[PDB]
Design a protein around this ligand. Structure first.
Ligand SMILES: *[C@@H]1O[C@H](CO)[C@@H](O[C@@H]2O[C@H](CO)[C@@H](O[C@H]3O[C@H](CO[C@H]4O[C@H](CO)[C@@H](O)[C@H](O)[C@@H]4O)[C@@H](O)[C@H](O)[C@@H]3O)[C@H](O)[C@H]2NC(C)=O)[C@H](O)[C@H]1NC(C)=O
Ligand SMILES: *[C@@H]1O[C@H](CO)[C@@H](O[C@@H]2O[C@H](CO)[C@@H](O[C@H]3O[C@H](CO[C@H]4O[C@H](CO)[C@@H](O)[C@H](O)[C@@H]4O)[C@@H](O)[C@H](O)[C@@H]3O)[C@H](O)[C@H]2NC(C)=O)[C@H](O)[C@H]1NC(C)=O
Ligand code: COH
Ligand code: COH
Ligand SMILES: CCCCCCCCO[C@@H]1O[C@H](CO)[C@@H](O)[C@H](O)[C@H]1O
Ligand SMILES: Cc1ccc(Cl)c(Nc2ccccc2C(=O)O)c1Cl
Ligand SMILES: Cc1ccc(Cl)c(Nc2ccccc2C(=O)O)c1Cl
Ligand SMILES: *[C@@H]1O[C@H](CO)[C@@H](O)[C@H](O)[C@H]1NC(C)=O
Ligand SMILES: *[C@@H]1O[C@H](CO)[C@@H](O)[C@H](O)[C@H]1NC(C)=O
Ligand SMILES: *[C@@H]1O[C@H](CO)[C@@H](O)[C@H](O)[C@H]1NC(C)=O
Ligand SMILES: *[C@@H]1O[C@H](CO)[C@@H](O)[C@H](O)[C@H]1NC(C)=O
Lengths: 551, 551
């Protein structure tokens, strides 16, 4: 296949013409020529006036005195936030295009929701090398890559101070749209909503939802233990959950997501959100005594969705970005813009979000310290200590650094390898191709990627060519930004995926973004004043202080 | 329920506040006040400059010499067509809101694709009257409505000259997204693509598609009969079709849509589009001898989708409108506008497209006249005459006028009654409520609606109040425009749904609307030069003259 070398630059579409020739479609790329590499006049100018991401990142992470002024001038904050949203939006194809089985546009790829979509097309089948034309005939041994480059020798804490509240929020939140269907294969998903629908609370299907609902006051089923509200059982709901035989019947908590019983950190947030839903039902009941159970349930769901997006932007992304600028969740910022209120989850977004290095060596709850074997599938620990003690402890324990290499816990060594192996059967293009796909300069050397000497040497011994380095491994060994959890690429690729999934949500559209949608101003206000602190304060006994970073 | 009165005007959202009070959400309506009835300053002006639809219709259907010059100046033609598209589209909620089960915004209503969506929410369950407050406690007998107002005494031909080519095209085309799942109920659909995906050619599911495909050269299965290409059999494809047991196996043609064997007219268009698909495969193979079966199939499908939208706008809607202005299919007209490339089929769109009056008393092919009992499920008629004779004959046979009342063939009486019964199951608001929803002044009397005395009287005897008249019966008895097939409402309500369904298609989005999407410029040119005449000329022996109007 002549398109194996990925000849078309700047988002140009490559098409074969006969057996030995190809053609590049430069339509609306701002470039022309055989490979869409010659800039148009207007393009030369725009390229000359674009700051580098590292320049812009510097600006947003310094001058705290300046940003403190900007954050308190609504007009400016709105203007800045508007830029942040729109300056990235042009990097996501919407409606979506390719998937694992289609490197050309097709109705199958567009219409079949069981697939993850793809930011870059899959490497064609019969190519000289797995990645196209660069690199060796065979990719390096995946286990060898994990051990030499990814495995933790000594715990590397996150310099930004991200804690376990953050790490488990990241996992809980993203696992509502990262639901890989490993029956079919890594290219397929079970989250047909393809975004923030809160299916991990309410269930992916109506059948599961009816098993989880109380059908009184709009609320979700629950049980009281030691005066505290917890999720219901599988026995009570008949809602299937993933549990080992060793887990007794009365400890098989049923929640929206079948796998959230795997780890107590997930069951903590599931409990918190469950409580929040029933709390909002009580508020709405007070406001609307004429409302029935169905409308109480549906309106509460729409509110929690709003809370979720609110919290993710203004607390979660806020902490992750390290910006002194105060991010703002406000759908009105897009009402005068060209924006598509739809989204399809990208397989690469999933891959890049394998933040295994976040995980500590042991989990520390109160006085106790649990290893992975003791912590996994253990709702006893949740009942023993309680949510309050969980929050206090998770807020204090720091997470591991994601970029910079060699920080993956040996306990999840198999999962790290799987991420590499699964990236290969989905035929991912190289790291540098994804750099270019998101307006970044390709690395010219291994040393430029890692910013050090020995890991880069290992990469060269394994891959040989810098253009042969794979997406997932490179993201984890990439040179971090100064005192940051990530490197340049992780942010520049992830941010557009993330913002698209948040602002693209239907509740953000002008027809939905109204008080009547959420039951009136009281309901609308719950969204617009939501925070990770208030979420905990409203639903966790004692109202403990919490944050996404260690104090 | 205080909202039974439909108090909120101008797209305002009604919400109950306690048992006896309500509240209107006037957000972004352009109006304010308790009822969203008081216009803002800009709105006050906008309404003043906006011409009435009857005026605009007059200007587009007269001054034939003036439009002749506008049509040949691309700057003017593009600008006008652009306004046509945008001015209509703002009347459609996208992403979609209500369905038959939800008169308030809910995630269930948004996410469940099995429902038709709703331009107006259902009438609340427990209201004084079926339509809310207006009208009698019980709606008139649906059979009495059909007999008095809708049944055809004597055939009334369409003044616009619509022929059977047009009638069967309307039926064939619209039945890809009007696929009511009566198993579940009238509120539900089997077309989860919710638009122009040509599932009626290729099948809804991948399983049925694989049954119809040849898996060589990207082609669809077929058989040759008298030198001419026809659809394959059920026995060969194992694709389910709906046929009475008395139909012999060799006459059981298998096509994408299960019901198209019902009438030869549909099976005619199914055969033509089948031929076109296999024709485009031959064209693409010449351009791409390096391509495989899968890519040839998928690319052909995308091209036929383009042809359909092209033909619908510049031939079908062009004839239907009666405009002297030449409508244009050009996705680039929207690339600088705010527009959502998504759509959800509205139940009301389905209802207003029950154009039963189009049907003739008998079907006239060559020298023979077939009644309904003769014509239904009779594919032997198709083979006897051939597609060419079908095209020649149907082009010449006049269709019935749709508006004006009393033109529904008694043969389909029970179908017309079902339209009324079903719309009542789904709790449609009144005809006047749908007029106001689409910026039309509500009718003051029955006489203003029909423009005459006889049907007016029978209407008042049945409904009592003008605000009690139902959508479907009113559309068919409405005073038709001068020498036109429809009345005002049908167009002003139908056109937004239609254009949104056409331009909202994914292939019209900037990422898709490129030559590379369609296999290069040769494929792209197939779309952009498509017409109903070229579709016939390329696939029907002898290249017979055809048109959507009688010669
Ligand atoms: C879009 O909306 C449609 C209309 O609301 C949804 O269709 C409806 O789906 C529900 C649930 O799938 C279905 O109700 C069925 O619920 C009963 C379930 O209870 C039984 O299930 C357990 C299973 O182990 C069993 O032990 C017991 O028998 C327990 O009682 C079914 O048993 C029963 O047959 C009933 O049909 C509705 O019938 C169905 N409605 C229609 C009109 O089709 C549709 O699911 C939704 N689409 C989504 C959410 O994707
Ligand atoms: C999105 O894409 C997915 C991947 O392409 C689609 O999943 C695939 O779906 C097909 C069928 O829907 C499935 O094929 C399976 O069908 C075989 C049966 O074939 C014969 O068997 C019956 C027996 O009665 C016969 O009557 C039929 O006529 C037919 O000739 C199975 O035996 C076999 O297991 C085979 O796998 C694929 O497995 C499946 N692939 C994956 C990876 O899941 C998915 O359907 C699509 N989503 C849509 C269209 O909504
Ligand atoms: C912040 C990100 C994050 C965290 C904290 C986290 C925390 C933990 C954790 C904590 C105790 C455990 C035991 C695991 C273990 C697993 N994770 Co994650 N995971 C994370 C991101 C992901 C993602 C993303 C996937 C793929 C999701 C999918 O496709 O369903 C994943 C998949 C897995 C799988 C599937 C294996 C496979 O073959 O793909 C296992 C097992 N893991 N992970
Ligand atoms: C231009 C529009 C048009 C035409 C010419 C047309 C011509 C014909 C025709 C010609 C020989 C026949 C035998 C019928 C007979 C039927 N029509 Co139509 N129909 C049309 C638009 C529709 C639509 C739209 C529906 C509802 C489709 C759905 O919900 O799936 C429909 C429904 C039906 C049904 C379903 C039963 C019911 O309860 O509604 C039958 C039977 N009919 N119609
Ligand atoms: C958890 C400990 C990981 C064991 C890694 C075994 C594979 C050898 O890994 C080696 O380890 C050395 C010391 O870290 C590095 O300096 C080398 O670059 C690396 O290749
Ligand atoms: C605008 C901006 C800036 C910095 C980060 Cl870290 C993000 N967010 C992410 C970056 C990389 C990967 C994931 C995310 C995320 O939002 O989840 C955003 Cl959206
Ligand atoms: C712009 C315009 C003008 C006139 C008609 Cl008739 C249409 N088309 C329809 C009008 C009413 C009902 C249906 C349609 C249609 O396109 O099918 C359009 Cl889109
Ligand atoms: C870019 O075009 C040149 C000739 O214009 C060609 O030799 C080269 O192969 C193209 N790029 C790639 C990566 O092949
Ligand atoms: C849960 O933790 C307890 C400690 O209280 C331990 O004894 C038990 O083995 C664990 N159960 C698991 C991991 O299933
Ligand atoms: C608004 O309309 C409702 C319709 O029933 C009416 O009861 C009410 O008096 C109106 N209020 C106004 C016009 O202020
Ligand atoms: C079907 O049409 C044929 C002519 O092609 C005719 O002989 C036959 O009687 C028709 N069938 C019915 C049931 O009328």
């Amino acid at each position: 296949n002549p398109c194996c070398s990925h000849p078309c630059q700047n988002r140009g579409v490559c098409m074969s013409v006969g057996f030995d020739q190809y053609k590049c479609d430069c339509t609306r790329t701002g470039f022309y020529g055989e490979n869409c590499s010659t800039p148009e006049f207007l393009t030369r100018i725009k390229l000359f006036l674009k700051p580098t991401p590292n320049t812009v990142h510097y600006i947003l992470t310094h001058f705290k005195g300046f940003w403190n002024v900007v954050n308190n001038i609504p007009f400016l904050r709105n203007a800045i936030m508007s830029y942040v949203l729109t300056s990235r939006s042009h990097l996501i194809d919407s409606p979506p295009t390719y998937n694992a089985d289609y490197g050309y546009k097709s109705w199958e790829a567009f219409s079949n929701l069981s697939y993850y979509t793809r930011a870059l097309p899959p490497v064609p089948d019969d190519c000289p090398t797995p990645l196209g034309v660069k690199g060796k005939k065979q990719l390096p041994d995946s286990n060898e890559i994990v051990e030499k480059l990814l495995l933790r020798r000594k715990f590397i804490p996150d310099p930004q101070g991200s804690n376990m509240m953050f790490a488990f929020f990241a996992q809980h939140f993203t696992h509502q749209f990262f639901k890989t269907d490993h029956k079919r294969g890594p290219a397929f998903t079970n989250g047909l909503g393809h975004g923030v629908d809160l299916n991990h609370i309410y269930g992916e299907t109506l059948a599961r939802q009816r098993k989880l609902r109380l059908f009184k006051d709009g609320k979700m089923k629950y049980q009281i233990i030691d005066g505290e509200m917890y999720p219901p059982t599988v026995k009570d709901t008949q809602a299937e959950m993933i549990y080992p035989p060793q887990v007794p019947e009365h400890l098989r908590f049923a929640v929206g997501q079948e796998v959230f019983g795997l780890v107590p950190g997930l069951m903590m947030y599931a409990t918190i959100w469950l409580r929040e839903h029933n709390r909002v039902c009580d508020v709405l009941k007070q406001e609307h005594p004429e409302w029935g159970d169905e409308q109480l349930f549906q309106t509460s769901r729409l509110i929690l969705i709003g809370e979720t997006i609110k919290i993710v932007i203004e607390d979660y992304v806020q902490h992750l970005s390290g910006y002194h600028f105060k991010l703002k969740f406000d759908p009105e910022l897009l009402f005068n813009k060209q924006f598509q209120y739809q989204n399809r989850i990208a397989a690469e977004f999933n891959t890049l979000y394998h933040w295994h290095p976040l995980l500590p060596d042991t989990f520390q709850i109160h006085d106790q310290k649990y290893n992975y074997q003791q912590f996994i599938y253990n709702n006893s620990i949740l009942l023993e200590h309680g949510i309050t003690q969980f929050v206090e402890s998770f807020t204090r324990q720091i997470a591991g650094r994601v970029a910079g290499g060699r920080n993956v816990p040996p306990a999840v060594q198999k999962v790290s390898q799987a991420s590499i192996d699964q990236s290969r059967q989905m035929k991912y293009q190289s790291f540098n191709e994804y750099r270019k796909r998101f307006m970044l300069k390709p690395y010219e050397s291994f040393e430029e990627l890692t910013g050090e000497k020995e890991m880069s040497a290992e990469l060269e011994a394994l891959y040989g060519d810098i253009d042969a380095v794979e997406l997932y491994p490179a993201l984890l060994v990439e040179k971090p930004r100064p005192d940051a959890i990530f490197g340049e690429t992780m942010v520049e690729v992830g941010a557009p995926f993330s913002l698209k999934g948040l602002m693209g949500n239907v509740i953000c559209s002008p027809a939905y973004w109204k008080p009547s949608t959420f039951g009136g101003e009281v309901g609308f206000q719950i969204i617009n004043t939501a925070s990770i602190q208030s979420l905990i304060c409203n639903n966790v006994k004692g109202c403990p202080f919490t944050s996404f970073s260690v104090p």
